[PDB]
Amino acid sequence: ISPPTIDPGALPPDGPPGPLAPMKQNAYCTEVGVLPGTDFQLQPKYMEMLNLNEAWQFGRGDGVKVAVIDTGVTPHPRLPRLIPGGDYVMAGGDGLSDCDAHGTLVASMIAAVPANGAVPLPSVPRRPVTIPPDAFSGIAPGVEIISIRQSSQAFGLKDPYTGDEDPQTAQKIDNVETMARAIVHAANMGASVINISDVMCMSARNVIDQRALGAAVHYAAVDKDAVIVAAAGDGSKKDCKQNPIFDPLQPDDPRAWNAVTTVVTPSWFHDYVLTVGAVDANGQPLSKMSIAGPWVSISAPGTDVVGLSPRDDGLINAIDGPDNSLLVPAGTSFSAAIVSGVAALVRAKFPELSAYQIINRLIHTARPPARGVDNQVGYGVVDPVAALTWDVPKGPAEPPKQLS
Amino acid sequence: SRIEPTNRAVLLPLGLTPEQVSQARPMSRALFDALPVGPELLVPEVPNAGGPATFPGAPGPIGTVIVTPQISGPQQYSLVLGDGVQTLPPLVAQILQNAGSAGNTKPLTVEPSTLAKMPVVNRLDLSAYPDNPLEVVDIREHPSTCWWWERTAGENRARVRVVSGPTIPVAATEMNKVVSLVKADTSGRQADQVYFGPDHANFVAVTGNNPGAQTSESLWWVTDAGARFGVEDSKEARDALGLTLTPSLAPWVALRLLPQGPTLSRADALVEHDTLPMD
Amino acid sequence: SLWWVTDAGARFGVEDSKEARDALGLTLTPSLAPWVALRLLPQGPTLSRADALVEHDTLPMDMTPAELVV
């Protein structure tokens, strides 16, 4: 498969958020809870690798706007800096309520404020759900979060016929188109870090036309200087299947683009998007859960997740599964949240640098894997304190002229 | 920690001189990354300076320095904030007077009976400054300085120290067998010399740079000639080479300086060549 | 021109000079061979003293290799 190409003439016109066709809710919202025997007075195990106690000396990232394009966010007394951006699933929404439990976890992991004897906003005006003392703290409590509701599992079309296109593929084309619009809109809001935690897997056989998405990525990355960070994709999703790695018999291409079988988008645009893989709390890669494509660029923790509870007012560890079973979340959708926090802290300390330079600062300071560059993890494991203080060369990586 | 040659108010009490600071010698990029960063040496920024105090009987406007008479015992300096007073270390009081002088040269002397009525408050951080003058080393006699990291087996904490001396900390007899490397990478991120002392480690696992790191992220092999080679962490690769053993820890800041060779894996070696090239 | 052929089927050029000969051995007189045949064997670098005098930290990798099948 040939690497992506871009035609900037395909930009979608700007406009207020709204679906392409009328939709209705089909399922009840997901319940949440805590696993037996947990004790929230201890820090989450993933916070040891980040060494936050040393990183916060230079600041907490005040004045940075981070856009969360996902399943929306529900307000909570610990998120005093949340802004309603828009909704693409329901015409009357604004992106400030998540029926799937995914959205509020990702956001709270970035900006939740630490505990205090009294909360700044004790009022609780939040609306009901729609029908058909504590050690936790975010990576950057000072940021400002913009919520945009891009996707959800609970909703469906209320005229299901789709003509000459298979109802399975007909939805993919709507998603690719609806994704480009959200990236353009979020850039005009002035966000400086755009975080994407939901992605599509597609077969390499007759890939869907992405011209509209290609121009949309370029516009936000160059003309608006935004840093785009995306998850490598959880392997339990409906169509994601594992990709092959480097092949010693063909040193022709070291990242092996010619052997690809599954394409992940927007993660695909390795020239403008930063893709994050996952590792456990000890440092080993989650070989069985993250897609090892050739576009992967960095990795961060992804287990022992903790976050603010939607529909309640406390913490949670798990979500109510299909059966009575209480199921624990894990995967790349959360690792991308960790890096979104580190990117916010770095470009608060070096405000003169552009997006292409901030990315090089994170890549060069990471601990690398045995092969130097790999596919399950990109250049290595993210490292906060190193990114904030080492003297990185301003130019990209270059090979030596002669070795003898 | 950073310091500026124009800030005479801070240089003088510490024991520094503007010329001395300006003539300081270079520092290598390699060592610059290894040392952790501490807060800057600047004049403390007392908040809301100059306004009236909230509490009664305040001896002066907010930010003035107070001292007690020597006849009643060792003098204790203090600072008057908006809602009370906080103590000051001797060396910092001198900086506040020198910087906050604006023509004033001495503090207000107040008796214990009137001092005891003022409420005690703690609202600003001051632990960065030392409590006595700096014993600056004359670089001509000690042209070498090194960062040292060590961890004892079974411990949960690594020890970080700085060493200074006339020459690299190697035994005088062994000074002849330091290895001089070629240097293909001109970015200034690769060392010039390498030394393998007593109790050196061949097989290593990468770890974080802070003293509290606990991860173990990848395995490497360091040859006698100074190059490092990576080992794929798989049962077949480990046993074929004979590395079924437990590896020793190492920090990334120190290890990244050795040149990197090809990767060792069973799949990479099953290849044939007619003749080798020479770029 | 003088050439040295290895059992693996590769040919290497050897310098005519006293230094190169005396160092490798090769003092005896060589046998004759026809160029239309000898050119069919793959060629390696020439064994000259002037280019052996080099240091390296790591070597370049070989493009387009072939599989070893067990």
Swiss-Prot record, chain A:
Gene3D superfamilies linked: Peptidase S8/S53 domain (3.40.50.200)
Its membrane topology: Single-pass membrane protein
Induction, per UniProt: Constitutively expressed during growth in culture.
Biased composition (Low complexity): 124-132
InterPro entries assigned to the protein according to its UniProt record, in alphabetical order: Peptidase_S8/S53_dom, Peptidase_S8/S53_dom_sf, Peptidase_S8_Asp-AS, Peptidase_S8_subtilisin-rel, T7SS_pept_S8A_mycosin
EC annotation from Swiss-Prot or TrEMBL: 3.4.21.-
Compartment annotation: Cell membrane
UniProt enzyme class: hydrolase
UniProt cross-references to NCBIfam families, sorted A to Z: T7SS_mycosin
Protein name listed in UniProt: Mycosin-5
UniProt source species: Mycobacterium tuberculosis (strain ATCC 25618 / H37Rv)
Curated annotation (Swiss-Prot), chain C:
Compartments it resides in: Cell inner membrane
Domain of life: Bacteria
Biological role: An ATPase (shown for residues 80-506). Part of the ESX-5 specialized secretion system, which is responsible for the secretion of EsxN and a number of PE_PGRS and PPE proteins, including PPE41.
Family of the protein in this entry: Belongs to the EccB family.
Note: Part of the eccB5-eccC5 operon, which is essential for in vitro growth.
Subunit structure as annotated in this protein's UniProt entry: Part of the ESX-5 / type VII secretion system (T7SS), which is composed of cytosolic and membrane components. The ESX-5 membrane complex is composed of EccB5, EccC5, EccD5 and EccE5.
Protein name listed in UniProt: ESX-5 secretion system ATPase EccB5
Span covered, complete protein: 435 to 504 of 506
